[PDB]
C-alpha cells in the first residue's frame, strides 16, 4: 500500500516542505517506488537512530505521509527529493522485501 | 583554518542561513554536540556517504560541509537530543579523525 | 488570554521553527507582552486585504501558539525573533486592546 | 543584468537554497507572481523596511534581494495564494519601480 | 566506484607503492584471487578488525584498504598460491558482502 | 638440542635478509615472541595450512621455516604487537611441539 | 617546519610506511646518516632528477620526499654502512643546502 | 659460467626472493636492462664501491651479486625507467666487460 522512508536527522510533520538528501540505494529504491505510483511516501523516524541500516524493528509505527514534489538524481547517483508533509498516519504491517520498506497505513 | 567537531548528516543538506531542528541519537554524535557546546558552540555539518557499518567512519563523509552554530540543545525524555542549528558558512575539511569521543577535523572556510 | 502576532507572508504550523522579522511597533509590543508572561504568542494569518494594516476583523480564526526562543533588535530597529510552533488554537474573541492584539484562544 | 518582478516580504527573509511555502493575500503581489509565471518563474524576494505598512512604496523596500524560482503556485477560491519558492541567488537592485501593476526591478546578480 | 574482490590480510599491512609477494593458502582467499584474475587483476587488500581469527566474517574486516594489481600469480604443488601484488591507491568500502565464494566490495577510490 | 619458538604465518614467506614488520594478535603467538625475547630474540617463522579449527595444531604447520631475529617489538594499545623481523636462514624442522604455551621447533640448520 | 639532513637515493624510492634496509657506501652520505643520528634519528629521503651523477649537486635533488626514521645503523669492517629506515611521511623541502659535509634542508610535512 | 648484463646499484643490496622496484636513469644502465629483455630477462645486480669514476671498473664492483629477473619495465615521464625485479640466485662475477653499450660479466651461480 505505501513505500516507507526512514528518517534519522529531521522529523517531518504535516505542512512542512523540506528538501531531503537520500544517498542510500534502498532508500532511493523507496523513492522510486513512490514515483512509480502516486508520489506518496510514508516518513517514519527510527526507534534506534544508531544504525543507518535499520530493520523493521527499528522503525516507529506512526509517521507522516508526504508527497514527493520534486526529485533529481545527482552525478554520483545520490538523490535530492523535495517532500511536503500531508497528514499523520499509523503503520500497520511493516514489511521489508529487500528492495525497500513498505506497509499499510491508516491516516490519523 | 580551524579545528572543529564534526556532526555527520544523512538526510539533509544544511546551507548557510538555514535554521533547523536536528535530532541526534548516537553517542559519538551527542558527544560531538557537547564538545562544541563547551567551546564557541560551533559545529561542522557534513553529509555521509553510504557505508556498510552502522555508523559512518572517518572515510565515509563528503569533504565540504557547513559550519553551524548550536542555537539550542535539548535532551528529550525518549533518550534523544533535539538540537536547533543555524548555518553560518561553507567549509572544507582536510584531516578528519575519530579520537574515540567524536569526529573532529580541520576546516577551511570557503 | 494570549498576545496575537499577525503574519502576512507565512502560515506557521506546530513543530515549525522559523525566524520572523517584526518592524511594526504594535507588533513589537506584542512580543514584549509575551516575554513578560510565558514567552508564548499566537501566530495568526492575515486574510486577503488592501488596507495598510489588519484590524480585529482581518485575521483568520485558527492560529498557532508558539514560543519565542530568542529575540534580537537589529540596527534599523526591526526585531528578529526565532519562534517554534507548539499547537493550533481557535480564536474565541480577538481584541485590539490599544497596545497589541490579544485573543481568547481554544487549543485544538 | 535582469529585469524581474519584485515580491515584498515583511515577515521572513529567504536566502539562496532555502525552500519555503509563502502566503500571499494582496492583489498587487498576486499580479507580481503572475508576471513571473508568464516568463521564467523567477521572482525577486525583497525585504520591507522597519515600519512600512502592507502597502509599501518603492522607498520602503531594501535594495538587495534573493532571486527565487516559483516551484508551485495555487490560487485559493478565497482570493488568497499559496506559492512555494526556492531561493537561487542574491541580486542587487539598481532601479526599483512600480509600473502600475506590481513592483519591478532591474537587478544584477551578486 | 568499482566492484572488487576483497582479500583480508592478517600478518602484514600493504600500502600504495608497496610491492610484495603474498602467500595464500586458504580456499576462500584463493577464489578471491581467481575472481580478480577473471576481472581486471585488481584486488582490494584489507586489514582485519579481529586479528585472532583466520575465518573473519564481513564484520571482522576494516572498510578502508589498498586496491592492488596482481602482477604475477603462480599455483604451487603444496596447494598454495604465491601472488605478487603492487599496492596502487587507498579506497573506501561502501558495501561489503560474502557471496559464499569470497568477499566482494563496492568500493570508492580515495 | 635447541628449541626455537614458532610463529605461524598466514600471508607471507620471509626469506633470509628480508626485513618486515609483522602484526601478531594471537595470545599464543605473542607468548612465542615473549619467549624469544627472554633468550635470543630468535624465532622460527612457519607457514600454516588451512586448519579445520581456527586454532591450528602441530599438524597444521609446514615442516620447513625461516629462523629470524626480532629487531624490535612494540606492544600496541589494543594489546596486539607489531614486531619487526629479519630473516636469517631457512631450515627444515625435525620436530615440532606445543608446550602448552606456544609452538616450538627443533631446526635442521 | 624543521631542519633535517638530506640523503639522496638513486636506486629506490622510499614512501611512508615502507621499512627498507639501505646500503650507504659514500662518505658524504655516511656523514649525512651520522648527523641524523646525533639528533632525533630523523632523515629526509629524496630522489634524484634524471641525468644526475653519483655526486649530485643541490639542483639534482627532488624537493618533495619522505621523512624517515633510522631504525638501526651498522658500520661494517670496510667503513661501508648498512642502515634500516622507516618512511614516516612526505615533506616538501625548501632551502636545500650543501656545506660540503652533507645535504641539509628546511622541510614542511605534507 | 654465464654471460649476463650487469646493473650497478648504489643504494640497496638485493637478495634472492626479494622483489623490489628499481629506478634506473643512466642510459648505459637502461641499455643494460634492454639487453636482458632481448634474451631471458636476467640481469646481474651488483653493488658498487665509491670510486673516483662514476663508470665503475671491475675493482669498483663487489664480486658477488644476485642474478634477478625483470618482472616489469615501466617508462617514466622524465625519460627514466622503473623496473620491477625479483632476486633469483647469488652469483660471483669473474670478468667485467664494457661492450661500449653496457656492462657485461661472466658469472658463476652461488
UniProtKB/Swiss-Prot annotation, chain F:
Induction: By accumulation of abnormal proteins, such as at high temperatures. Under stress conditions. It is found in: Cytoplasm. It comes from the Bacteria. Disruption phenotype: When both lon and ycgE are disrupted levels of OmpF decrease, leading to lower drug susceptibility, with a greater effect at 26 degrees than at 37 degrees Celsius. The mechanism is not yet understood. Decreased persister cell formation upon antibiotic challenge due probably due to increased levels of MazF toxin. Belongs to the peptidase S16 family. ATP-dependent serine protease that mediates the selective degradation of mutant and abnormal proteins as well as certain short-lived regulatory proteins, including some antitoxins. Required for cellular homeostasis and for survival from DNA damage and developmental changes induced by stress. Degrades polypeptides processively to yield small peptide fragments that are 5 to 10 amino acids long. Binds to DNA in a double-stranded, site-specific manner. This is Lon protease. It comes from Escherichia coli (strain K12).
